[PDB]
């Protein structure tokens, strides 16, 4: 929950997106990332640039 | 998500989404439906009993 006041020369890339809610049982997202980062998501498990 | 049945009444939550109105099927003692678990993928015969 947030209330935004976009500062000068923000920008939405997207707008106002919903979160992901994977389908409990069977429903997947799959990802590559851009760059390389360690314990960067969620997961607190590094990816390799492209992995 | 999960479902409820049963002598209740129900407000859906600020944070829980009715997805489906179920209604169950009645069976004759001697018939019955073809369910399938989503989860198991297992496909079996239900039955004898309403369901």
Redesign the interface.
């Given at each position: 929950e947030k209330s935004f006041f976009l500062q000068p020369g923000e920008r939405l890339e997207r707008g106002i997106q919903d979160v992901y809610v994977l389908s409990?049982?069977?429903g997947l997202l799959l990802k590559a990332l851009q760059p390389l980062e360690e314990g960067e998501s969620e997961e607190k498990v590094s990816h390799q640039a492209g992995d | 998500?999960w479902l409820i049945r049963g002598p209740l009444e129900y407000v859906p939550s600020a944070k829980v989404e009715v997805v489906e109105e179920r209604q169950a099927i009645p069976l004759d003692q001697n018939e019955g439906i073809y369910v399938q678990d989503?989860?198991t993928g297992k496909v079996r015969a239900v039955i004898g009993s309403t369901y």
């Open positions: 409990e049982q069977q | 998500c989503v989860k």
